[PDB]
Amino acid sequence: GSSGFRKMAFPSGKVEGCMVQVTCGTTTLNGLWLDDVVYCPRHVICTSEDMLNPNYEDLLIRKSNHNFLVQAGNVQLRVIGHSMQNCVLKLKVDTANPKTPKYKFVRIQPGQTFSVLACYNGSPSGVYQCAMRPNFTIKGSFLNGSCGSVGFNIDYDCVSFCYMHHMELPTGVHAGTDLEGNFYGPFVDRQTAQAAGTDTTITVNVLAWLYAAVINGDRWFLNRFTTTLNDFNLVAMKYNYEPLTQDHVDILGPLSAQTGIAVLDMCASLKELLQNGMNGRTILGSALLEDEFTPFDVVRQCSG
Amino acid sequence: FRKMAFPSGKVEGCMVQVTCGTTTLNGLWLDDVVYCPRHVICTSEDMLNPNYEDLLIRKSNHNFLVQAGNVQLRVIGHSMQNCVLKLKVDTANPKTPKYKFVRIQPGQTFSVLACYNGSPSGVYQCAMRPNFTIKGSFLNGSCGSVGFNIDYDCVSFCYMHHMELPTGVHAGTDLEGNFYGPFVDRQTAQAAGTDTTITVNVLAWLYAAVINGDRWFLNRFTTTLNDFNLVAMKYNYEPLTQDHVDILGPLSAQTGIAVLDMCASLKELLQNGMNGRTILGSALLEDEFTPFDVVRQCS
Ligand SMILES: Cn1cnc(Cn2c(=O)c3c(=O)n(C)c(-c4cc(C#N)ccc4Cl)cc3n(Cc3cc(F)c(F)c(F)c3)c2=O)n1
Ligand SMILES: Cn1cnc(Cn2c(=O)c3c(=O)n(C)c(-c4cc(C#N)ccc4Cl)cc3n(Cc3cc(F)c(F)c(F)c3)c2=O)n1
């Protein structure tokens, strides 16, 4: 049929050119170097004696510039200023990053997707795509030493940084901040076991992925039941799916036009899947309903 | 575990576009040579069965438009090597990474940088299927996009995309222009043969499950390699080679589970099914993570 379907990340080169390593004493993690400032998680100034409940502002006033070792590949960068914005440490260095891309800091909404460049000791190791969960965690793939890896989207030639990785929660999901240092979700940069709120499924993204499945020739789940938007949302909420808004229906328009399947008709298919299950069948090779592709992700991949 | 691509920056810096007339596709610029599919020299009249030798004889350096963005790179020599065109240019790419060309085996995974008009659009992980296709994601204009692995600072290029087959899977060559599989670069009826399951990767996935403490399927037996291979083929699984056994060695050592004991465990799963149980939260056995991917991603 059409031309295949995969989780796809943005090319990571523009972000790779910004990754550095930041060390405080025995403590090492990753930083992001843009112009003459390096941004990283402030937890780097804590020690194991501090980590349970750090007083960051005490820790920082006791710091000197020379306490921070910033390395870009093989070159050591001189720190000539330091400050802290929320949970992000900013180190001013005496040289600009020549590879600084055009960029913006943005705070993303639950449901939106982004790419993550996982790094260790300042070196990029892998790229993958994630979503901000409705409970403001992310289901990433990160190991010890990934602290400071960033998430982003690319538009034309501009990198929108939206995430900086801080921690792994006990359930194995991940928590972090925007680039102003504000956590997504109710989390705190202390080494304490932290639970997230109950998660829900991102309905508009499931619908977008069902439209991808149709574009790829997988149509077994379609039906002719009718639904209104309100009645679809009542069933959705019953199954811990997020509400679908009229803005969602509008954003699904291009996918609906391309496949000739009305958005509310696709909702009636999803309603049936939620009530009856998949009967051990798959959709796009998946046994589960996938909710980490946005409408934009689908269109870009299947039309653009 | 999840599927990760390699950081794509080293390959991004090698992508260019190649145009002949009104036809444009992607090329790879390493040192002073640009590599691209030779299909670029065909017209819509040539496509069913092109005479590539003839079409190339009629080409001169001045007929090829190579661009890095809007910047044209002057072509100073051309040749064809199997199904790849090689265009020598007058500028060595200053972003050339350390690199090798390698030809991979079925089962091996790699990252694809999908590009359109020389501009990278996205990166994803893929496996070479046993039928020598990939289940990629590509649109028209993606011809010449490449697949690669990175080891330390070195980029091992293993795939250059040529075409989509009627089932929507993809076919291409190595960087010496030799197709994976029986495919040819012309618009004919060619079809992917029936595919099979990549046994060595399933085994690596079971090892990953064990490492993470998910070990219910470890049965009390062992098997010979021959008996396992004969049973595997009955379930449309690939037979294991001696090289597969060897690449499983680091996971076998890490878990203390002999390769042939894990084979016996998989044999029971094939013969009996899951009983409704899951492995790593999946009712399905995954066959697109290699033993390297498990090592790479658990560490
Ligand atoms: C398994 N895994 C998956 N993702 C991760 C990411 N990941 C790391 O990369 C990492 C690291 O590299 N490092 C280095 C430290 C660290 C340890 C000490 C000590 N003793 C002091 C400072 C730090 Cl930053 C903590 C880290 N932590 C714990 C942590 C991180 C925080 F920013 C935080 F505010 C908090 F309260 C706790 C972490 O979660 N791990
Ligand atoms: C939906 N989709 C998914 N993957 C793709 C990749 N994809 C392209 O990107 C693409 C392209 O960009 N282009 C430009 C051409 C093209 C057309 C003409 C004409 N007329 C002449 C030369 C070429 Cl290279 C053919 C292409 N083809 C067809 C093709 C490509 C071959 F190299 C080949 F040997 C063959 F016999 C047939 C293709 O498959 N498309």
Side-chain angles (χ1 to χ4, degrees), chain A residues 1 4-48 50-155 157-278 280-302 304, chain B residues 2-47 49-219 221-299:
Chain A
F5 195 68
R6 282 266 179 196
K7 224 145 231 194
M8 201 176 299
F10 281 106
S12 58
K14 291 179 172 54
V15 180
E16 287 168 51
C18 300
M19 297 313 301
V20 303
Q21 173 178 50
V22 177
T23 295
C24 270
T26 255
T27 308
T28 307
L29 47 57
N30 311 96
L32 180 77
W33 179 31
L34 299 167
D35 302 310
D36 66 342
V37 177
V38 174
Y39 300 76
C40 69
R42 73 178 175 177
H43 202 61
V44 69
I45 77 180
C46 295
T47 69
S48 68
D50 268 314
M51 71 189 20
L52 186 47
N53 180 206
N55 190 299
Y56 281 111
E57 290 270 15
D58 289 351
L59 289 165
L60 182 61
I61 198 152
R62 293 171 185 165
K63 276 271 171 176
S64 301
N65 295 326
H66 63 90
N67 296 322
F68 298 102
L69 169 63
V70 176
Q71 292 162 267
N74 228 309
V75 73
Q76 199 178 129
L77 308 182
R78 225 208 340 151
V79 177
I80 64 172
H82 56 276
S83 65
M84 147 168 99
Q85 181 173 7
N86 305 122
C87 296
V88 159
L89 173 71
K90 301 187 292 196
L91 301 181
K92 184 168 77 198
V93 289
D94 68 1
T95 45
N97 190 2
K99 292 166 196 297
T100 307
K102 187 186 198 276
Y103 79 89
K104 293 175 316 164
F105 293 166
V106 306
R107 186 170 172 95
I108 63 167
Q109 299 254 45
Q112 296 186 301
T113 52
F114 50 102
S115 294
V116 167
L117 178 65
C119 298
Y120 297 91
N121 298 120
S123 295
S125 70
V127 61
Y128 56 94
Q129 190 80 349
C130 288
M132 185 47 66
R133 303 304 305 170
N135 70 0
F136 288 108
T137 60
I138 78 167
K139 298 193 183 216
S141 178
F142 286 123
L143 299 175
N144 211 345
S146 56
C147 194
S149 293
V150 298
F152 60 98
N153 280 292
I154 313 203
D155 186 326
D157 61 329
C158 187
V159 182
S160 285
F161 291 104
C162 62
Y163 177 82
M164 169 163 286
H165 184 46
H166 285 65
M167 50 202 192
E168 186 169 289
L169 304 189
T171 50
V173 301
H174 306 290
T177 59
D178 59 27
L179 277 289
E180 294 185 347
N182 288 126
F183 267 89
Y184 289 101
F187 309 111
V188 179
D189 45 351
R190 54 164 84 185
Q191 179 73 32
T192 224
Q194 295 176 236
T198 307
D199 205 19
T200 49
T201 302
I202 309 155
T203 308
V204 59
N205 289 5
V206 177
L207 288 173
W209 174 78
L210 291 174
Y211 277 112
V214 165
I215 291 157
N216 285 289
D218 223 343
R219 309 182 55 96
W220 65 263
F221 49 85
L222 301 173
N223 70 47
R224 307 148 39 237
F225 284 132
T226 56
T227 193
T228 67
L229 177 64
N230 184 68
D231 290 341
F232 166 76
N233 282 152
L234 283 172
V235 178
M237 298 189 273
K238 176 189 194 199
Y239 283 90
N240 266 268
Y241 271 53
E242 290 294 298
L244 195 70
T245 65
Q246 182 56 50
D247 285 345
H248 296 147
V249 174
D250 286 347
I251 294 152
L252 290 168
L255 289 176
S256 182
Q258 178 180 351
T259 57
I261 298 167
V263 176
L264 295 173
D265 293 344
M266 194 63 83
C267 283
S269 298
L270 178 49
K271 181 190 296 176
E272 173 178 38
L273 293 165
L274 295 178
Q275 300 176 326
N276 302 325
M278 297 179 51
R281 306 192 62 167
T282 65
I283 292 170
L284 289 171
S286 167
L288 299 167
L289 299 183
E290 163 79 40
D291 73 342
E292 299 200 353
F293 294 93
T294 67
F296 166 88
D297 299 345
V298 174
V299 169
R300 189 181 187 267
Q301 173 169 354
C302 303
Chain B
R2 82 133 78 198
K3 283 157 179 189
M4 293 192 326
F6 290 98
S8 55
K10 289 173 160 75
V11 174
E12 284 170 60
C14 297
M15 292 315 302
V16 295
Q17 32 184 164
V18 183
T19 299
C20 271
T22 197
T23 297
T24 298
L25 46 50
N26 305 103
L28 182 72
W29 178 21
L30 299 164
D31 295 318
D32 60 353
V33 179
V34 168
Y35 302 82
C36 74
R38 66 173 183 177
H39 204 62
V40 72
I41 70 177
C42 292
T43 59
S44 45
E45 297 63 60
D46 277 308
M47 266 170 8
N49 196 193
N51 181 332
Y52 285 103
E53 285 81 10
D54 229 88
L55 287 164
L56 189 63
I57 284 161
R58 302 172 185 293
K59 285 284 194 185
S60 299
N61 293 325
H62 60 82
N63 292 131
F64 293 98
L65 176 60
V66 178
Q67 302 160 294
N70 291 331
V71 175
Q72 170 178 10
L73 300 185
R74 190 165 43 87
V75 176
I76 64 172
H78 59 276
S79 63
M80 142 178 103
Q81 177 176 14
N82 306 122
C83 301
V84 290
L85 177 78
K86 292 191 293 203
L87 300 180
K88 188 180 179 163
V89 289
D90 68 1
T91 302
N93 180 5
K95 298 173 111 80
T96 306
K98 292 184 193 329
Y99 73 97
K100 276 154 30 162
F101 294 164
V102 306
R103 185 174 177 83
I104 52 169
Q105 278 296 99
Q108 292 192 256
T109 55
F110 51 98
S111 298
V112 171
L113 178 68
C115 302
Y116 296 95
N117 313 114
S119 189
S121 67
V123 68
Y124 56 87
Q125 277 296 97
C126 243
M128 176 63 65
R129 302 306 307 179
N131 65 2
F132 292 116
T133 66
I134 62 168
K135 302 168 139 215
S137 171
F138 286 122
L139 294 180
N140 183 61
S142 61
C143 195
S145 294
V146 301
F148 62 96
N149 281 279
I150 306 188
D151 56 281
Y152 308 94
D153 53 352
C154 186
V155 183
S156 280
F157 295 97
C158 58
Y159 177 79
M160 177 164 278
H161 182 45
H162 287 62
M163 59 200 184
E164 171 205 47
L165 298 177
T167 49
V169 298
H170 308 294
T173 65
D174 63 22
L175 270 295
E176 291 188 313
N178 292 119
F179 264 93
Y180 292 101
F183 309 109
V184 291
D185 56 352
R186 74 194 70 122
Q187 293 249 305
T188 304
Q190 316 172 60
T194 48
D195 201 23
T196 48
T197 300
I198 302 162
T199 304
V200 66
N201 290 358
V202 179
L203 293 165
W205 180 253
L206 299 173
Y207 277 112
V210 174
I211 291 162
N212 285 101
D214 196 2
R215 56 169 189 271
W216 66 260
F217 47 88
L218 294 178
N219 87 344
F221 300 116
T222 200
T223 174
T224 64
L225 189 53
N226 185 60
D227 286 349
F228 177 75
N229 282 356
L230 296 175
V231 176
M233 293 203 61
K234 294 176 166 92
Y235 292 87
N236 258 63
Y237 267 59
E238 285 293 300
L240 293 174
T241 65
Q242 189 70 346
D243 286 352
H244 298 152
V245 173
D246 286 298
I247 59 165
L248 287 169
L251 297 169
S252 180
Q254 184 177 348
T255 60
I257 304 303
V259 174
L260 293 176
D261 299 353
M262 190 67 87
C263 291
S265 292
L266 174 57
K267 186 171 131 181
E268 190 188 321
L269 291 167
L270 303 181
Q271 289 173 337
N272 304 135
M274 312 271 280
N275 263 351
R277 278 167 122 328
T278 72
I279 291 167
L280 290 164
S282 183
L284 281 8
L285 297 176
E286 172 62 58
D287 82 335
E288 292 200 358
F289 281 107
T290 66
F292 309 120
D293 297 334
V294 182
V295 167
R296 183 204 153 190
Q297 153 156 208
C298 303
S299 82

